[PDB]
Write a protein that binds this ligand. Structure first.
Ligand code: SAH
Length: 237
């Protein structure tokens, strides 16, 4: 099912990049394609940042109690939290990313899809960082997302999520303008081809509206300098 799907290692380009760098301290380029944007790269060394950006640093410092690191990748956030003495569980659908996390010393790294009906555990803080909205994919998945959050959150728990308003990319020189933040991507590493995926960017007002429609409250915590922000989502009282 869509909700339980994991990446096969043979179609796991980001995991393969991470594993090359972990095992060999060297890597080819992780290439990113899109129907909306020209071909680019995701720098691989930066996936191992200790050096994190403002919004991510802000979120880690605020994270308390039992923490879920969603889409944890190389384990950078999970390792930072462990070093603070914090309790963290990390999840990712990438098998090679989970391999690396374990070998780097993440104590509780699991290969599981956030949306899996069988994934059941509760948390005081749920971290969705590095365009944390991405995993949601499309606005039509907002109800599913908030249903899952209700299952995973302890009383007085919160979700800390960063995203970006991409409107500026879709305007002409004079500012004249599916939701524009519904992007698709596909990645390639060496001869490893990943399947295309939906990756949601969401502006704060849109996020607040969908939160309110699903029994959540959104709070702006911090703005960055490139149309980016950190929000806190909680179950509405
Ligand atoms: N449904 C899902 N459940 C869990 N992890 C998912 C997911 N969909 C995507 N992912 C993972 O989310 C990650 C997004 S990339 C961001 C990685 C990491 N948080 C960092 O800041 O560097 C990838 O590792 C990807 O495999």
């Amino acid at each position: 099912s869509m909700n339980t799907s994991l990446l096969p290692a043979e179609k796991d380009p980001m995991g393969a990049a991470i594993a090359d760098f972990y095992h060999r301290q060297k890597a080819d380029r992780l290439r990113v394609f899109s129907s909306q944007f020209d071909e680019d790269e995701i720098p691989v060394k930066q996936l191992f940042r200790k050096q994190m950006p403002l919004l991510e640093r802000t979120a880690l410092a605020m994270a308390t109690g039992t923490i879920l690191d969603v889409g944890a990748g190389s384990g950078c956030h999970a390792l930072a939290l462990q070093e603070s003495g914090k309790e963290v569980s990390a999840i990712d659908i990438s098998p090679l990313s989970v391999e690396v996390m374990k070998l780097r010393g993440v104590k509780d790294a699991r290969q599981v899809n956030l949306f899996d009906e069988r994934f059941a555990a509760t948390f005081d803080t749920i971290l969705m960082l590095m365009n944390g909205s991405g995993i949601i994919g499309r606005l039509e998945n907002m109800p599913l997302f908030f249903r899952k959050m209700k299952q995973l959150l302890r009383p007085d728990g919160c979700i800390l999520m960063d995203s970006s308003d991409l409107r500026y990319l879709f305007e002409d020189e004079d500012g004249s303008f599916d939701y524009y933040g519904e992007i698709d991507f596909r990645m390639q590493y060496k001869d490893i081809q990943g399947d295309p995926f939906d990756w949601l960017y969401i502006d704060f007002q849109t996020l607040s509206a969908y939160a309110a429609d699903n029994g959540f409250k959104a709070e702006m915590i911090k703005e960055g300098k490139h149309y980016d922000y950190l929000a806190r989502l909680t179950v509405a009282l």
